[PDB]
Design a protein around this motif. Structure first.
Motif, PDB file in Angstrom:
ATOM      1  N   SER A 108      -3.071   5.488 -14.161  1.00 32.52           N
ATOM      2  CA  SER A 108      -4.157   5.103 -15.057  1.00 32.52           C
ATOM      3  C   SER A 108      -4.574   3.640 -14.959  1.00 32.52           C
ATOM      4  N   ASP A 150       0.854  -1.180   0.000  1.00 33.89           N
ATOM      5  CA  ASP A 150       0.000   0.000   0.000  1.00 33.89           C
ATOM      6  C   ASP A 150       0.895   1.236   0.000  1.00 33.89           C
ATOM      7  N   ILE A 151       0.725   2.107  -0.996  1.00 32.60           N
ATOM      8  CA  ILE A 151       1.553   3.303  -1.089  1.00 32.60           C
ATOM      9  C   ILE A 151       1.457   4.159   0.170  1.00 32.60           C
ATOM     10  N   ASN A 181      -6.924  13.161 -10.730  1.00 30.78           N
ATOM     11  CA  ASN A 181      -7.696  13.729 -11.821  1.00 30.78           C
ATOM     12  C   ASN A 181      -7.408  15.231 -11.929  1.00 30.78           C
ATOM     13  N   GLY A 189      -5.964   1.849 -12.580  1.00 31.95           N
ATOM     14  CA  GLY A 189      -7.090   1.535 -11.727  1.00 31.95           C
ATOM     15  C   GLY A 189      -8.383   1.958 -12.377  1.00 31.95           C
ATOM     16  N   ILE A 190      -9.052   2.925 -11.749  1.00 31.01           N
ATOM     17  CA  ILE A 190     -10.360   3.367 -12.210  1.00 31.01           C
ATOM     18  C   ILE A 190     -10.289   4.053 -13.580  1.00 31.01           C
ATOM     19  N   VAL A 198      -5.587   5.455  -5.056  1.00 39.33           N
ATOM     20  CA  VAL A 198      -4.422   6.067  -4.436  1.00 39.33           C
ATOM     21  C   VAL A 198      -4.779   7.428  -3.838  1.00 39.33           C
TER      22      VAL A 198
HETATM   23  N1  LIG Z   1      -3.349   2.466  -1.653  1.00 42.23           N
HETATM   24  C1  LIG Z   1      -2.799   2.024  -2.850  1.00 42.23           C
HETATM   25  N2  LIG Z   1      -1.498   1.763  -2.901  1.00 42.23           N
HETATM   26  C2  LIG Z   1      -0.949   1.367  -4.051  1.00 42.23           C
HETATM   27  N3  LIG Z   1      -1.582   1.149  -5.207  1.00 42.23           N
HETATM   28  C3  LIG Z   1      -2.894   1.403  -5.133  1.00 42.23           C
HETATM   29  C4  LIG Z   1      -3.576   1.846  -3.999  1.00 42.23           C
HETATM   30  N4  LIG Z   1      -4.905   2.012  -4.308  1.00 42.23           N
HETATM   31  C5  LIG Z   1      -5.008   1.690  -5.589  1.00 42.23           C
HETATM   32  N5  LIG Z   1      -3.819   1.296  -6.115  1.00 42.23           N
HETATM   33  C6  LIG Z   1      -3.511   0.881  -7.476  1.00 42.23           C
HETATM   34  O1  LIG Z   1      -2.959   2.061  -8.163  1.00 42.23           O
HETATM   35  C7  LIG Z   1      -3.250   1.956  -9.516  1.00 42.23           C
HETATM   36  C8  LIG Z   1      -3.952   3.233  -9.974  1.00 42.23           C
HETATM   37  O2  LIG Z   1      -5.309   3.194  -9.557  1.00 42.23           O
HETATM   38  P1  LIG Z   1      -6.143   4.518  -9.216  1.00 42.23           P
HETATM   39  O3  LIG Z   1      -5.741   5.062  -7.891  1.00 42.23           O
HETATM   40  O4  LIG Z   1      -7.570   4.145  -9.426  1.00 42.23           O
HETATM   41  O5  LIG Z   1      -5.602   5.567 -10.298  1.00 42.23           O
HETATM   42  P2  LIG Z   1      -5.987   5.884 -11.839  1.00 42.23           P
HETATM   43  O6  LIG Z   1      -4.857   6.700 -12.362  1.00 42.23           O
HETATM   44  O7  LIG Z   1      -6.372   4.632 -12.540  1.00 42.23           O
HETATM   45  O8  LIG Z   1      -7.307   6.758 -11.703  1.00 42.23           O
HETATM   46  C9  LIG Z   1      -7.224   8.084 -11.179  1.00 42.23           C
HETATM   47  C10 LIG Z   1      -8.443   8.318 -10.337  1.00 42.23           C
HETATM   48  O9  LIG Z   1      -8.320   7.530  -9.210  1.00 42.23           O
HETATM   49  C11 LIG Z   1      -8.765   8.296  -8.042  1.00 42.23           C
HETATM   50  O10 LIG Z   1     -10.065   8.119  -7.850  1.00 42.23           O
HETATM   51  C12 LIG Z   1      -8.338   9.734  -8.500  1.00 42.23           C
HETATM   52  O11 LIG Z   1      -8.956  10.732  -7.634  1.00 42.23           O
HETATM   53  C13 LIG Z   1      -8.569   9.814  -9.844  1.00 42.23           C
HETATM   54  O12 LIG Z   1      -9.885  10.356 -10.188  1.00 42.23           O
HETATM   55  C14 LIG Z   1      -4.081   0.666  -9.731  1.00 42.23           C
HETATM   56  O13 LIG Z   1      -3.243  -0.353 -10.218  1.00 42.23           O
HETATM   57  C15 LIG Z   1      -4.575   0.399  -8.295  1.00 42.23           C
HETATM   58  O14 LIG Z   1      -4.772  -0.998  -7.996  1.00 42.23           O
END
Ligand SMILES: Nc1ncnc2c1ncn2[C@@H]1O[C@H](COP(=O)(O)OP(=O)(O)OC[C@H]2O[C@H](O)[C@H](O)[C@@H]2O)[C@@H](O)[C@H]1O
Length: 165
Positions: free
Chosen positions: A124, A18-19, A36, A126-127, A45
């Motif tokens: 990018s 977890d970061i 975003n 994740g969501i 994250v």
């Molecule tokens: N705590 C964590 N530690 C490490 N990696 C993580 C964690 N949580 C998620 N990941 C991974 O980190 C990676 C990125 O997932 P994302 O955080 O969705 O980022 P994006 O760039 O796709 O989406 C940006 C949106 O996410 C937010 O809602 C923002 O406010 C933006 O609106 C994935 O592989 C996750 O499994």
């Protein structure tokens, strides 16, 4: 003080972690947020980092946007790291799920080259809907400074570290 990372290349390292917990333990100079353009830190994250700052990251971000307006897709800004790091580099990867160009992921990772050492997530992946292995490959092929990648998801980590770059 980064510990337990697998080496990928000369300059890129990776860990199933977890970061937020990595940042709390290491207190790096720079932690990267996967933001975003509005710096609305809702989930993933961003939401986890912000929660760990007891919302100070969001309060600061709201003032940043009020002064400067939205970031660009592929862009970034440097803000405080609060209790987690000296600085947080907020970087906006493309929201591929909403039609934004995946090519902007390279522009996003280029921001990392302005910092010697970073703790970072896969932008990018994740969501925002980019293929995670693609995000890792773009990172490796774009970032030249020393980047420690924290991958929260165990299943994803195990797949990534067994894939060609
Ligand atoms: N705590 C964590 N530690 C490490 N990696 C993580 C964690 N949580 C998620 N990941 C991974 O980190 C990676 C990125 O997932 P994302 O955080 O969705 O980022 P994006 O760039 O796709 O989406 C940006 C949106 O996410 C937010 O809602 C923002 O406010 C933006 O609106 C994935 O592989 C996750 O499994």
């Amino acid at each position: 003080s980064f510990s337990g990372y697998l080496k990928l290349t000369d300059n890129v390292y990776i860990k199933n972690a977890d970061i937020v917990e990595e940042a709390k333990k290491v207190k790096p100079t720079v932690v990267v947020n996967a933001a975003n353009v509005y710096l609305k830190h809702g989930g993933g994250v961003a939401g986890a980092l912000n929660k760990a700052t007891n919302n100070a990251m969001q309060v600061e971000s709201d003032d940043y946007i009020a002064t400067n307006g939205p970031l660009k897709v592929g862009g970034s800004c440097v803000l405080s790291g609060h209790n987690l790091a000296k600085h947080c580099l907020h970087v906006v990867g493309p929201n591929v799920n909403k039609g934004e160009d995946i090519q902007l992921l390279k522009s996003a990772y280029e921001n990392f080259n302005q910092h010697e050492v970073l703790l970072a997530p896969l932008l990018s992946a994740g969501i925002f809907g980019a293929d995670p292995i693609h995000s890792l490959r773009v990172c490796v092929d774009t970032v030249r400074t020393n980047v420690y990648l924290a991958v929260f998801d165990k299943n994803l980590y195990d797949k990534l570290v067994s894939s060609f770059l």
